[PDB]
N, CA, C and O atoms as a DFTB+ gen file, in Angstrom:
656 C
 N C O
     1  1      18.836     -19.966     -10.820
     2  2      17.652     -19.975     -10.969
     3  2      16.999     -18.437     -11.503
     4  3      17.416     -17.377     -11.037
     5  1      15.765     -18.521     -12.694
     6  2      15.725     -17.275     -13.420
     7  2      14.725     -16.732     -12.063
     8  3      14.347     -17.127     -10.960
     9  1      14.574     -15.332     -13.151
    10  2      13.959     -14.253     -11.840
    11  2      13.026     -13.862     -12.435
    12  3      13.319     -13.102     -13.358
    13  1      11.652     -14.130     -12.249
    14  2      10.258     -13.766     -12.942
    15  2       9.498     -12.352     -12.124
    16  3       9.123     -12.338     -10.952
    17  1       9.427     -11.445     -12.916
    18  2       8.665     -10.381     -12.979
    19  2       6.899     -10.129     -12.995
    20  3       6.252     -10.043     -14.038
    21  1       6.597     -10.082     -12.283
    22  2       5.810      -9.616     -12.772
    23  2       4.241      -7.901     -12.283
    24  3       4.392      -7.257     -11.245
    25  1       3.610      -7.737     -12.791
    26  2       2.124      -6.624     -12.666
    27  2       1.570      -7.566     -11.361
    28  3       1.222      -8.745     -11.426
    29  1       1.587      -6.875     -10.408
    30  2       0.283      -6.678      -9.211
    31  2      -1.187      -7.435     -10.031
    32  3      -1.800      -7.043     -11.025
    33  1      -1.367      -8.386      -9.339
    34  2      -2.505      -9.651      -9.362
    35  2      -3.132      -8.760      -9.757
    36  3      -3.174      -8.613     -10.978
    37  1      -3.900      -7.770      -8.845
    38  2      -5.182      -7.277      -8.708
    39  2      -4.891      -5.823      -9.964
    40  3      -5.128      -4.635      -9.748
    41  1      -4.327      -6.435     -11.233
    42  2      -4.144      -5.416     -11.938
    43  2      -4.357      -6.030     -13.024
    44  3      -4.486      -5.532     -14.142
    45  1      -4.389      -6.854     -12.798
    46  2      -4.796      -7.935     -14.417
    47  2      -6.101      -7.061     -15.342
    48  3      -6.714      -6.116     -14.845
    49  1      -6.290      -7.446     -16.366
    50  2      -6.773      -6.751     -17.276
    51  2      -7.340      -7.764     -18.153
    52  3      -6.770      -8.844     -18.311
    53  1      -8.884      -7.347     -18.969
    54  2      -9.817      -7.800     -18.885
    55  2     -10.559      -7.217     -20.351
    56  3     -11.580      -7.619     -20.909
    57  1      -9.884      -6.426     -20.619
    58  2     -10.658      -5.112     -21.723
    59  2      -9.256      -4.282     -22.022
    60  3      -8.198      -4.180     -21.401
    61  1      -9.733      -3.759     -23.221
    62  2      -8.736      -2.930     -23.560
    63  2      -7.819      -2.654     -24.220
    64  3      -7.485      -3.693     -24.789
    65  1      -6.792      -1.371     -24.677
    66  2      -5.215      -1.616     -25.881
    67  2      -4.558      -1.392     -24.044
    68  3      -5.056      -0.919     -23.023
    69  1      -3.088      -2.085     -24.421
    70  2      -2.214      -1.688     -23.637
    71  2      -0.995      -1.970     -23.812
    72  3      -0.785      -2.732     -24.756
    73  1      -0.157      -1.640     -23.263
    74  2       0.901      -1.102     -23.763
    75  2       2.653      -1.081     -22.816
    76  3       3.111      -0.277     -22.005
    77  1       3.064      -2.008     -23.250
    78  2       4.824      -1.916     -22.010
    79  2       5.400      -2.104     -22.971
    80  3       5.173      -2.539     -24.100
    81  1       6.530      -1.572     -22.188
    82  2       8.095      -1.700     -22.756
    83  2       8.856      -2.313     -22.041
    84  3       8.675      -2.094     -20.843
    85  1      10.167      -3.458     -22.447
    86  2      10.837      -3.601     -22.056
    87  2      12.022      -3.567     -21.966
    88  3      12.108      -4.112     -23.066
    89  1      13.304      -3.404     -21.612
    90  2      14.674      -2.708     -22.124
    91  2      15.757      -2.853     -21.594
    92  3      16.245      -2.482     -20.526
    93  1      16.265      -3.712     -22.848
    94  2      17.546      -4.966     -22.778
    95  2      19.206      -4.050     -21.657
    96  3      19.628      -2.909     -21.842
    97  1      19.604      -4.826     -20.874
    98  2      21.347      -4.496     -21.016
    99  2      21.935      -5.639     -21.918
   100  3      22.840      -5.635     -22.752
   101  1      21.029      -6.695     -21.413
   102  2      22.128      -7.618     -21.641
   103  2      21.333      -8.335     -22.723
   104  3      20.118      -8.227     -22.555
   105  1      21.797      -9.217     -24.062
   106  2      21.262      -9.838     -25.093
   107  2      20.835     -10.976     -25.358
   108  3      20.534     -11.511     -26.425
   109  1      20.820     -11.564     -23.565
   110  2      20.512     -12.974     -23.987
   111  2      19.355     -13.588     -23.489
   112  3      18.345     -13.212     -24.084
   113  1      19.120     -14.572     -22.419
   114  2      18.140     -15.886     -22.272
   115  2      16.970     -14.846     -21.073
   116  3      16.762     -15.026     -19.873
   117  1      16.381     -13.736     -22.057
   118  2      14.764     -13.671     -21.338
   119  2      13.837     -13.219     -21.943
   120  3      14.045     -12.549     -22.955
   121  1      12.529     -13.471     -21.471
   122  2      11.518     -13.617     -22.253
   123  2      10.150     -12.778     -21.175
   124  3       9.995     -12.991     -19.972
   125  1       9.162     -11.659     -22.190
   126  2       8.770     -11.310     -21.837
   127  2       7.513     -11.862     -22.635
   128  3       7.350     -12.825     -23.384
   129  1       6.564     -10.690     -22.083
   130  2       4.740     -10.975     -22.862
   131  2       4.140     -10.479     -21.845
   132  3       4.327      -9.412     -21.259
   133  1       3.003     -11.766     -21.563
   134  2       1.869     -11.675     -20.474
   135  2       1.465     -12.678     -19.987
   136  3       1.523     -13.705     -20.663
   137  1       0.908     -12.717     -18.619
   138  2       0.451     -14.100     -18.486
   139  2      -0.616     -13.999     -17.121
   140  3      -0.757     -13.008     -16.403
   141  1      -1.396     -15.474     -16.974
   142  2      -2.006     -15.174     -16.968
   143  2      -1.916     -14.890     -14.752
   144  3      -0.824     -15.044     -14.205
   145  1      -3.212     -14.500     -13.875
   146  2      -2.976     -14.008     -13.432
   147  2      -2.753     -15.070     -12.204
   148  3      -3.768     -15.741     -12.388
   149  1      -2.112     -15.677     -11.077
   150  2      -3.083     -16.769     -10.543
   151  2      -2.014     -17.670      -9.886
   152  3      -2.348     -18.707      -9.312
   153  1       6.931     -23.052     -15.585
   154  2       7.936     -22.569     -15.883
   155  2       8.700     -22.322     -16.822
   156  3       9.015     -23.503     -16.971
   157  1       9.506     -21.610     -17.896
   158  2      10.063     -21.506     -18.399
   159  2       8.762     -20.614     -19.420
   160  3       7.790     -21.015     -20.058
   161  1       9.199     -19.605     -19.229
   162  2       7.656     -18.623     -19.867
   163  2       7.442     -18.716     -21.312
   164  3       8.246     -18.648     -22.242
   165  1       5.752     -18.943     -21.281
   166  2       5.346     -19.345     -22.046
   167  2       5.083     -20.907     -23.317
   168  3       4.726     -21.188     -24.462
   169  1       5.570     -21.478     -22.052
   170  2       6.072     -23.706     -22.335
   171  2       4.966     -23.981     -21.760
   172  3       4.913     -25.201     -21.605
   173  1       3.830     -23.346     -21.267
   174  2       2.703     -23.787     -21.166
   175  2       1.845     -23.068     -21.726
   176  3       2.266     -22.426     -22.689
   177  1      -0.131     -22.846     -21.232
   178  2      -0.738     -21.737     -21.367
   179  2      -0.875     -20.539     -20.329
   180  3      -1.702     -19.632     -20.244
   181  1      -0.284     -20.715     -19.929
   182  2       0.203     -19.660     -18.752
   183  2       0.131     -18.236     -18.765
   184  3      -0.467     -17.371     -18.125
   185  1       1.115     -18.295     -19.911
   186  2       1.701     -16.816     -19.684
   187  2       1.840     -17.068     -21.562
   188  3       1.666     -18.243     -21.887
   189  1       2.148     -16.012     -22.821
   190  2       2.204     -15.172     -24.317
   191  2       3.370     -14.579     -23.932
   192  3       3.369     -13.650     -23.125
   193  1       4.699     -15.163     -24.586
   194  2       5.873     -14.721     -25.087
   195  2       6.655     -14.284     -25.987
   196  3       6.821     -15.130     -26.866
   197  1       7.369     -13.066     -26.204
   198  2       8.369     -13.064     -26.459
   199  2      10.190     -13.515     -26.005
   200  3      10.564     -13.161     -24.887
   201  1      11.033     -14.147     -26.770
   202  2      12.280     -14.833     -26.715
   203  2      12.870     -14.230     -27.892
   204  3      12.695     -14.565     -29.064
   205  1      13.662     -13.207     -27.387
   206  2      14.163     -12.506     -28.929
   207  2      15.315     -12.696     -28.224
   208  3      16.200     -11.861     -28.411
   209  1      15.522     -13.579     -27.468
   210  2      17.583     -14.564     -27.125
   211  2      17.058     -15.197     -28.496
   212  3      17.718     -14.600     -29.347
   213  1      16.217     -16.088     -29.148
   214  2      15.869     -17.180     -29.772
   215  2      14.961     -16.672     -31.040
   216  3      15.084     -17.287     -32.099
   217  1      14.370     -15.953     -30.988
   218  2      13.299     -15.506     -31.727
   219  2      12.191     -16.428     -32.206
   220  3      11.931     -17.113     -33.195
   221  1      11.674     -16.122     -31.053
   222  2      10.453     -17.794     -31.055
   223  2       9.348     -16.735     -30.220
   224  3       9.569     -15.899     -29.344
   225  1       7.963     -17.197     -30.950
   226  2       6.525     -16.880     -29.739
   227  2       6.556     -17.389     -28.743
   228  3       7.554     -16.863     -28.252
   229  1       6.254     -17.945     -28.153
   230  2       5.605     -19.184     -26.577
   231  2       4.778     -18.950     -25.900
   232  3       4.472     -18.102     -25.063
   233  1       4.107     -20.493     -26.686
   234  2       2.293     -20.179     -25.699
   235  2       2.358     -21.258     -25.739
   236  3       1.723     -21.407     -26.783
   237  1       2.747     -22.709     -25.304
   238  2       2.220     -24.397     -25.096
   239  2       3.035     -24.726     -25.699
   240  3       2.928     -25.837     -26.220
   241  1       4.395     -23.835     -25.957
   242  2       5.594     -24.305     -26.977
   243  2       6.239     -23.160     -28.083
   244  3       6.145     -21.934     -28.147
   245  1       6.492     -23.528     -28.384
   246  2       7.764     -22.463     -29.624
   247  2       7.318     -22.226     -30.882
   248  3       7.350     -23.127     -31.720
   249  1       6.864     -21.033     -31.164
   250  2       7.520     -21.138     -33.245
   251  2       8.018     -20.303     -33.109
   252  3       7.934     -19.635     -32.078
   253  1       9.126     -19.853     -34.639
   254  2      10.065     -18.780     -35.268
   255  2       9.096     -17.497     -34.799
   256  3       7.956     -17.764     -34.417
   257  1       9.446     -16.418     -34.820
   258  2       9.063     -15.149     -35.277
   259  2       9.912     -14.336     -34.707
   260  3      10.673     -14.603     -33.777
   261  1       9.743     -13.011     -35.446
   262  2      10.427     -11.840     -35.241
   263  2      11.881     -11.897     -35.507
   264  3      12.207     -12.316     -36.618
   265  1      12.628     -11.617     -34.842
   266  2      14.197     -11.484     -34.960
   267  2      14.560     -11.788     -33.629
   268  3      13.766     -11.942     -32.701
   269  1      16.208     -11.897     -33.555
   270  2      16.922     -11.872     -32.179
   271  2      17.138      -9.776     -31.804
   272  3      17.392      -8.940     -32.671
   273  1      16.986      -9.575     -30.727
   274  2      17.305      -8.833     -30.162
   275  2      19.077      -8.210     -29.735
   276  3      19.776      -9.078     -29.214
   277  1      19.404      -7.533     -29.834
   278  2      20.656      -6.895     -29.435
   279  2      20.675      -6.185     -28.112
   280  3      19.740      -6.030     -27.327
   281  1      21.799      -5.821     -28.027
   282  2      22.009      -4.798     -26.013
   283  2      21.317      -3.823     -26.670
   284  3      21.095      -3.759     -27.879
   285  1      20.984      -3.061     -25.802
   286  2      20.146      -1.877     -24.902
   287  2      18.574      -2.107     -25.934
   288  3      17.513      -1.856     -25.362
   289  1      18.547      -2.383     -26.801
   290  2      16.696      -2.633     -27.638
   291  2      16.307      -2.780     -26.451
   292  3      16.837      -3.161     -25.407
   293  1      14.183      -2.028     -27.085
   294  2      13.787      -1.956     -26.196
   295  2      12.598      -2.957     -26.887
   296  3      12.395      -2.869     -28.098
   297  1      11.727      -4.034     -25.949
   298  2      10.704      -4.400     -26.762
   299  2       9.549      -3.580     -26.333
   300  3       9.578      -3.143     -25.182
   301  1       8.372      -3.264     -27.212
   302  2       7.122      -3.468     -27.117
   303  2       6.193      -4.595     -27.032
   304  3       6.215      -5.671     -27.629
   305  1       5.230      -4.048     -26.017
   306  2       4.469      -5.645     -25.616
   307  2       3.050      -4.315     -26.205
   308  3       3.054      -3.108     -25.963
   309  1       2.425      -4.785     -26.674
   310  2       0.571      -4.553     -27.259
   311  2      -0.249      -6.384     -27.022
   312  3       0.088      -7.496     -27.427
   313  1      -1.597      -5.805     -26.041
   314  2      -2.599      -6.173     -26.074
   315  2      -3.638      -5.655     -26.326
   316  3      -3.962      -4.724     -25.590
   317  1      -4.377      -5.963     -27.222
   318  2      -5.874      -6.074     -27.709
   319  2      -6.428      -6.991     -26.714
   320  3      -5.941      -8.087     -26.435
   321  1      -7.690      -6.371     -26.091
   322  2      -7.933      -7.681     -24.922
   323  2      -9.699      -8.045     -25.509
   324  3     -10.383      -8.836     -24.859
   325  1     -10.354      -7.247     -26.985
   326  2     -11.150      -7.090     -27.393
   327  2     -11.465      -7.757     -28.421
   328  3     -12.607      -8.071     -28.755
   329  1     -10.073      -8.101     -29.185
   330  2      -9.703      -8.493     -30.377
   331  2      -9.357     -10.230     -30.077
   332  3      -9.719     -11.338     -30.472
   333  1      -8.646      -9.756     -29.347
   334  2      -8.267     -11.151     -28.543
   335  2      -6.440     -11.253     -29.264
   336  3      -6.004     -12.366     -29.561
   337  1      -5.515      -9.923     -29.471
   338  2      -4.497     -10.027     -30.608
   339  2      -3.194      -9.839     -29.231
   340  3      -3.315      -9.635     -28.023
   341  1      -2.242      -9.986     -29.938
   342  2      -1.154      -9.446     -28.949
   343  2       0.227      -9.446     -30.436
   344  3       0.812     -10.423     -30.904
   345  1       0.352      -8.053     -30.801
   346  2       1.965      -7.568     -30.812
   347  2       2.747      -7.558     -30.499
   348  3       2.734      -7.014     -29.394
   349  1       4.219      -8.045     -30.943
   350  2       5.385      -6.957     -31.158
   351  2       6.621      -5.769     -31.668
   352  3       7.091      -5.696     -32.803
   353  1       6.899      -5.082     -30.745
   354  2       7.839      -4.232     -31.857
   355  2       9.256      -4.655     -31.060
   356  3       9.274      -5.440     -30.112
   357  1      10.904      -3.728     -31.839
   358  2      11.422      -4.298     -31.812
   359  2      12.520      -3.421     -31.842
   360  3      13.517      -3.710     -32.503
   361  1      12.421      -2.117     -31.031
   362  2      13.033      -1.061     -31.224
   363  2      12.221      -0.282     -32.522
   364  3      12.652       0.329     -33.500
   365  1      11.221      -0.514     -32.180
   366  2       9.783       0.240     -32.377
   367  2       8.767      -0.261     -33.978
   368  3       7.676       0.040     -34.462
   369  1       9.895      -1.142     -34.318
   370  2       9.376      -2.331     -36.319
   371  2       8.190      -3.716     -34.990
   372  3       8.489      -4.554     -34.139
   373  1       7.359      -3.373     -35.373
   374  2       7.118      -4.853     -35.528
   375  2       7.174      -5.582     -36.562
   376  3       7.027      -5.380     -37.767
   377  1       7.551      -6.994     -35.536
   378  2       7.535      -8.692     -35.958
   379  2       6.777      -9.479     -36.805
   380  3       5.606      -9.534     -37.182
   381  1       7.326      -9.792     -36.900
   382  2       6.086     -10.788     -38.453
   383  2       6.651     -12.118     -37.961
   384  3       7.831     -12.442     -37.825
   385  1       5.265     -12.985     -37.668
   386  2       5.524     -14.466     -38.151
   387  2       6.223     -14.959     -39.500
   388  3       6.749     -14.066     -40.164
   389  1       6.280     -15.951     -39.875
   390  2       6.589     -16.979     -40.228
   391  2       5.677     -16.663     -41.946
   392  3       6.014     -16.365     -43.092
   393  1       4.354     -16.965     -41.171
   394  2       3.185     -16.303     -42.480
   395  2       3.253     -14.704     -42.527
   396  3       2.387     -14.170     -43.220
   397  1       4.018     -14.012     -41.986
   398  2       4.016     -12.824     -42.530
   399  2       2.906     -11.869     -42.106
   400  3       2.407     -10.890     -42.661
   401  1       2.689     -12.455     -40.974
   402  2       1.454     -11.773     -39.596
   403  2       1.868     -11.330     -38.934
   404  3       2.965     -11.775     -38.596
   405  1       1.240      -9.899     -38.098
   406  2       2.026      -8.789     -37.235
   407  2       0.992     -10.022     -35.917
   408  3       1.330     -10.080     -34.735
   409  1       0.410     -10.424     -36.195
   410  2      -0.155     -11.564     -34.599
   411  2       0.485     -12.242     -33.799
   412  3       0.429     -13.470     -33.842
   413  1       1.165     -11.641     -32.980
   414  2       2.039     -12.599     -32.260
   415  2       1.462     -13.988     -31.767
   416  3       1.957     -15.113     -31.827
   417  1       0.570     -13.660     -31.391
   418  2      -1.164     -14.560     -30.684
   419  2      -1.859     -13.812     -31.146
   420  3      -1.641     -12.637     -31.441
   421  1      -3.058     -14.611     -31.291
   422  2      -4.713     -14.087     -31.395
   423  2      -5.570     -15.533     -31.501
   424  3      -5.264     -16.675     -31.843
   425  1      -7.156     -14.702     -30.893
   426  2      -7.912     -15.680     -30.558
   427  2      -7.882     -16.969     -29.471
   428  3      -7.998     -18.170     -29.714
   429  1      -7.675     -16.246     -28.124
   430  2      -6.987     -16.346     -27.044
   431  2      -8.449     -16.546     -25.962
   432  3      -9.527     -16.087     -26.338
   433  1      -8.330     -17.236     -24.681
   434  2      -9.442     -16.250     -24.200
   435  2      -8.988     -15.581     -22.741
   436  3      -8.093     -15.778     -21.919
   437  1     -10.386     -14.469     -22.928
   438  2      -9.886     -13.219     -22.048
   439  2      -9.748     -14.213     -20.025
   440  3      -9.209     -13.649     -19.072
   441  1     -10.270     -15.392     -19.954
   442  2      -9.960     -15.904     -18.775
   443  2     -10.554     -14.665     -17.985
   444  3     -11.514     -13.902     -18.085
   445  1      -8.847     -14.992     -16.665
   446  2      -9.164     -14.114     -15.452
   447  2      -8.180     -12.434     -15.560
   448  3      -7.799     -11.673     -14.670
   449  1      -7.985     -12.359     -17.714
   450  2      -7.274     -11.530     -18.454
   451  2      -5.542     -11.966     -17.736
   452  3      -5.063     -12.978     -17.226
   453  1      -4.816      -9.995     -18.186
   454  2      -3.914     -10.588     -18.326
   455  2      -2.961      -9.344     -17.612
   456  3      -3.356      -8.181     -17.539
   457  1      -1.231      -9.959     -16.949
   458  2      -0.986      -9.001     -16.769
   459  2       1.055      -8.939     -17.374
   460  3       1.661      -9.898     -17.853
   461  1       1.661      -7.464     -17.109
   462  2       2.922      -7.783     -17.734
   463  2       4.067      -9.276     -17.259
   464  3       3.869      -9.778     -16.153
   465  1       4.537      -9.523     -17.636
   466  2       5.507     -10.189     -16.640
   467  2       7.139     -10.509     -17.459
   468  3       7.362      -9.792     -18.434
   469  1       7.526     -10.876     -17.323
   470  2       8.850     -11.200     -17.801
   471  2       9.751     -11.933     -17.220
   472  3       9.516     -12.096     -16.023
   473  1      11.089     -12.650     -17.769
   474  2      11.486     -13.633     -17.155
   475  2      13.526     -12.641     -17.626
   476  3      13.769     -11.839     -18.528
   477  1      14.256     -13.080     -16.813
   478  2      15.813     -13.204     -17.035
   479  2      16.070     -14.466     -16.674
   480  3      15.299     -15.117     -15.969
   481  1      17.029     -14.849     -17.069
   482  2      17.976     -16.107     -17.082
   483  2      19.296     -15.795     -16.549
   484  3      19.472     -14.727     -15.964
   485  1      20.131     -16.544     -16.685
   486  2      21.460     -16.525     -15.839
   487  2      22.203     -14.626     -15.909
   488  3      21.333     -13.869     -16.341
   489  1      22.944     -14.216     -15.723
   490  2      23.542     -12.926     -15.526
   491  2      22.446     -11.758     -16.086
   492  3      22.759     -10.613     -15.762
   493  1      21.574     -11.854     -16.644
   494  2      21.111     -10.780     -18.031
   495  2      20.441      -9.676     -17.154
   496  3      20.215      -9.647     -15.944
   497  1      20.306      -9.179     -17.706
   498  2      19.823      -7.855     -16.955
   499  2      18.807      -6.238     -17.920
   500  3      19.160      -5.273     -18.598
   501  1      17.363      -6.852     -17.360
   502  2      16.522      -6.199     -18.541
   503  2      15.510      -5.725     -17.722
   504  3      15.439      -6.276     -16.624
   505  1      14.698      -4.839     -17.967
   506  2      13.115      -4.495     -17.040
   507  2      12.413      -3.878     -17.805
   508  3      12.709      -3.144     -18.748
   509  1      11.029      -4.317     -17.204
   510  2       9.479      -3.718     -17.384
   511  2       9.676      -1.989     -17.528
   512  3      10.436      -1.510     -16.686
   513  1       9.275      -1.359     -18.172
   514  2       8.228       0.133     -18.684
   515  2       7.157       0.333     -18.389
   516  3       6.558       0.787     -19.364
   517  1       6.359       0.221     -17.292
   518  2       4.872       0.297     -17.234
   519  2       4.252       2.065     -17.645
   520  3       3.056       2.342     -17.544
   521  1       5.318       3.105     -18.104
   522  2       4.809       4.313     -18.374
   523  2       4.266       5.075     -17.665
   524  3       3.517       5.923     -18.151
   525  1       4.421       5.018     -16.720
   526  2       4.207       6.243     -15.349
   527  2       4.250       7.048     -15.621
   528  3       3.307       7.796     -15.879
   529  1       5.731       7.323     -15.707
   530  2       5.860       9.288     -17.241
   531  2       6.190       7.883     -18.445
   532  3       6.773       6.802     -18.537
   533  1       5.225       8.979     -19.302
   534  2       5.083       8.247     -20.397
   535  2       5.965       8.618     -21.405
   536  3       6.168       8.036     -22.471
   537  1       6.738      10.175     -20.755
   538  2       8.049      10.816     -21.638
   539  2       9.021       8.939     -21.591
   540  3       9.384       8.331     -22.598
   541  1       9.182       8.507     -20.272
   542  2       9.959       7.205     -20.001
   543  2       9.799       6.681     -21.614
   544  3      10.637       6.671     -22.515
   545  1       8.258       6.217     -21.601
   546  2       8.681       4.977     -22.747
   547  2      10.044       5.878     -23.828
   548  3      10.562       6.990     -23.725
   549  1      10.303       4.245     -25.239
   550  2      11.396       5.190     -25.759
   551  2      10.932       5.073     -27.629
   552  3      11.503       5.576     -28.596
   553  1       9.269       3.907     -27.541
   554  2       9.237       3.452     -28.961
   555  2       7.482       3.587     -29.104
   556  3       6.675       3.149     -29.923
   557  1       7.370       4.393     -27.912
   558  2       5.766       4.291     -27.964
   559  2       4.854       4.817     -28.374
   560  3       3.695       4.479     -28.613
   561  1       5.865       6.401     -28.528
   562  2       5.385       7.634     -29.786
   563  2       5.309       7.091     -31.199
   564  3       4.501       7.452     -32.054
   565  1       6.828       5.623     -31.412
   566  2       6.602       5.580     -33.042
   567  2       5.802       4.583     -33.127
   568  3       5.492       4.891     -34.278
   569  1       4.999       3.378     -32.882
   570  2       4.351       2.925     -32.348
   571  2       3.387       1.899     -31.185
   572  3       3.776       0.874     -30.625
   573  1       2.371       2.406     -31.096
   574  2       1.126       2.259     -30.305
   575  2       1.019       3.212     -29.916
   576  3      -0.173       3.109     -29.629
   577  1       1.196       3.885     -29.710
   578  2       0.268       5.539     -29.391
   579  2      -0.346       5.891     -29.970
   580  3      -1.031       6.654     -29.289
   581  1      -1.060       5.907     -32.056
   582  2      -1.599       6.592     -32.287
   583  2      -2.293       5.089     -32.739
   584  3      -3.508       5.275     -32.805
   585  1      -2.113       4.327     -32.919
   586  2      -3.319       2.854     -32.639
   587  2      -3.744       3.107     -31.882
   588  3      -4.887       2.893     -32.285
   589  1      -3.911       3.556     -30.632
   590  2      -4.639       3.333     -29.302
   591  2      -4.473       2.228     -28.199
   592  3      -5.588       1.808     -27.888
   593  1      -3.436       1.595     -27.480
   594  2      -2.731       0.965     -26.644
   595  2      -2.573       2.244     -25.629
   596  3      -2.244       3.239     -26.275
   597  1      -2.656       2.400     -24.797
   598  2      -2.451       2.805     -23.636
   599  2      -1.655       1.901     -22.738
   600  3      -1.699       0.671     -22.731
   601  1      -0.688       2.935     -21.739
   602  2       0.823       2.985     -20.965
   603  2      -0.075       1.553     -20.340
   604  3      -1.264       1.386     -20.612
   605  1       0.673       0.651     -19.530
   606  2       0.187      -0.565     -18.885
   607  2      -0.258       0.635     -17.339
   608  3      -1.126       0.360     -16.510
   609  1       0.458       1.695     -17.324
   610  2       0.584       1.602     -16.219
   611  2      -0.948       2.915     -15.286
   612  3      -1.350       3.273     -14.179
   613  1      -1.190       3.100     -16.696
   614  2      -2.746       4.018     -16.966
   615  2      -4.075       2.833     -16.161
   616  3      -5.265       3.129     -16.064
   617  1      -3.445       1.507     -15.674
   618  2      -4.343       0.518     -15.380
   619  2      -3.378       0.064     -14.006
   620  3      -3.500      -1.103     -13.634
   621  1      -2.637       0.762     -13.419
   622  2      -1.877       0.352     -12.025
   623  2      -2.094       2.188     -10.895
   624  3      -1.731       2.035      -9.729
   625  1      -2.592       3.609     -11.228
   626  2      -2.689       4.470     -10.834
   627  2      -3.665       4.052     -10.104
   628  3      -2.894       3.615      -9.249
   629  1      -4.497       3.845      -9.759
   630  2      -5.700       3.928      -9.071
   631  2      -5.184       2.470      -7.548
   632  3      -4.974       1.271      -7.734
   633  1      -5.144       3.185      -6.319
   634  2      -4.752       2.501      -5.565
   635  2      -6.423       2.459      -4.101
   636  3      -6.362       2.527      -2.873
   637  1      -7.205       2.374      -4.693
   638  2      -8.442       2.812      -3.519
   639  2      -9.607       1.749      -4.675
   640  3      -9.567       1.688      -5.903
   641  1     -10.353       1.182      -3.917
   642  2     -11.208       0.394      -4.796
   643  2     -12.568       0.967      -3.385
   644  3     -12.451       1.587      -2.327
   645  1     -13.854       0.299      -4.184
   646  2     -14.906       0.815      -2.968
   647  2     -15.879      -0.039      -3.339
   648  3     -16.350      -0.241      -4.458
   649  1     -16.271      -0.775      -1.748
   650  2     -17.932      -1.655      -1.766
   651  2     -19.099      -1.857      -1.242
   652  3     -18.854      -2.178      -0.080
   653  1     -20.124      -1.862      -1.383
   654  2     -21.750      -1.364      -1.248
   655  2     -21.906      -0.285      -1.955
   656  3     -23.007       0.263      -2.010
């Protein structure tokens, strides 16, 4: 069976610009991106994902996008919840679709927001880094920081809520 990892759903984002990284030891069947809170990632409308095994973007199906990853690579994942766009980097380089666009996905609805998600297939090894310690991010300073994206950990530091 596949292992699916997700941020705690209470930290779903509905606005702002957010960033996380996915660092892989292996280079096979994994996917990473953004999931709605609430199968194979991005085959339906519940997630938006990059597949660096086959170089595809997945949301309600697949299209060619970017390029395949190698062992040791790091994917950067960016979402702008106000402009309704998503971008991905591979070792800091922005990936493009076959039209030459950096918008991996666009014009989606905010709905209940998104949380980071990834999937690891058989024998795969990779991990999401939300950047609680920003110095442990590898490509954020190269692409993400200047562009105004915040590490997702910034959204998960608070653990108290207020009523009335």
